[PDB]
Scaffold this active site. Sequence first.
Site, short mmCIF file in Angstrom:
data_model
loop_
_atom_site.label_atom_id
_atom_site.label_comp_id
_atom_site.label_asym_id
_atom_site.label_seq_id
_atom_site.Cartn_x
_atom_site.Cartn_y
_atom_site.Cartn_z
N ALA A 18 12.07 59.85 109.08
CA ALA A 18 12.90 58.67 108.84
C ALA A 18 12.03 57.46 108.51
O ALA A 18 12.27 56.73 107.54
CB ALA A 18 13.81 58.37 110.06
N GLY A 20 8.37 57.55 108.28
CA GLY A 20 7.05 57.77 107.69
C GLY A 20 6.74 59.23 107.42
O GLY A 20 7.48 60.12 107.91
N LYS A 37 2.51 61.35 112.49
CA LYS A 37 3.44 60.58 111.68
C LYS A 37 2.86 59.21 111.43
O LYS A 37 2.50 58.51 112.38
CB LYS A 37 4.79 60.48 112.38
CG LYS A 37 5.87 59.76 111.60
CD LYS A 37 7.20 59.95 112.45
CE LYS A 37 8.46 59.62 111.77
NZ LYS A 37 9.49 60.06 112.75
N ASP A 129 21.17 62.20 113.43
CA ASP A 129 20.79 62.76 112.13
C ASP A 129 20.44 64.23 112.25
O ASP A 129 19.45 64.71 111.71
CB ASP A 129 19.65 61.97 111.49
CG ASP A 129 19.57 62.15 109.98
OD1 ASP A 129 20.53 62.65 109.38
OD2 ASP A 129 18.52 61.76 109.42
#
EC number: 2.7.11.1
Length: 269
Positions: A18, A20, A37, A129
């Site tokens: 989301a 990176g 990340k 999500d």
Amino acid sequence: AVPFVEDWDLVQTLGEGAYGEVQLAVNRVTEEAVAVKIVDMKRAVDCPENIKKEICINKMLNHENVVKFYGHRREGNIQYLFLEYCSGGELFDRIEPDIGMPEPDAQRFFHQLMAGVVYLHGIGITHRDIKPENLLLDERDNLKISDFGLATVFRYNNRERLLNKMCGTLPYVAPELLKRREFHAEPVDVWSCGIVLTAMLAGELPWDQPSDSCQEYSDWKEKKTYLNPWKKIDSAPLALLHKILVENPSARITIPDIKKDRWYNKPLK
Ligand SMILES: Cc1cc2n[nH]c(=O)n2c2cc(-c3ccc[nH]3)ccc12
């Protein structure tokens, strides 16, 4: 990063989160693998707060079906998060397009998904999500829920709050996000889990979005399960999907009742 990169090989890109890009890092001496990340906080004025929140939620988590969080640090405007490397890859890549995967495999993954979601909901966190790209697998094909960039707290101690943010990935979003100004968190995650189950069983997302104007969603509301993807799905798991993909979130099946479903409990090959 400087001394880190001397000792660890950033081997390759794993994917996009989301907030990176995620790299595989391997220590040259021990060969330990971690996922790193890399978040450029200059991409938005609210990124520092947003990534701080993802970090804060990650620090709350400890469950066998959730990607482990090791730590973080900042270098200038870049935030680095250090996460479990899930060497089985994305659930997405176990789904053959237009076919799915064998029913026993889908059932097992769905059980593990429920375990992870039950855990999150129990601590008052909603992911928001859930989709096969955000469900990773370890070296024994155990499912791990990934990426808490869009996650938020929906229960403070034993006091729930309603949510209002239209976030998530459109084909996975519950219809109340397009209809109600505020809504309960848990049924939204239940719905996305149903779309994931559909994709696992038939290799196809059923609609662009759950609006009456979307013909494929109207088709489902009208019980046209003789159309794709539904006609590929056996009646037993389809009966579960009929209970999950219920438009009114108040009437939608809850996870404790998913646990009582015939297919959920069915001995398969
Ligand atoms: C986007 C993403 C985040 C992540 N966090 N931890 C991880 O292992 N990953 C990932 C791992 C893979 C993968 C592919 C093959 C083996 N693994 C892919 C994406 C991610």
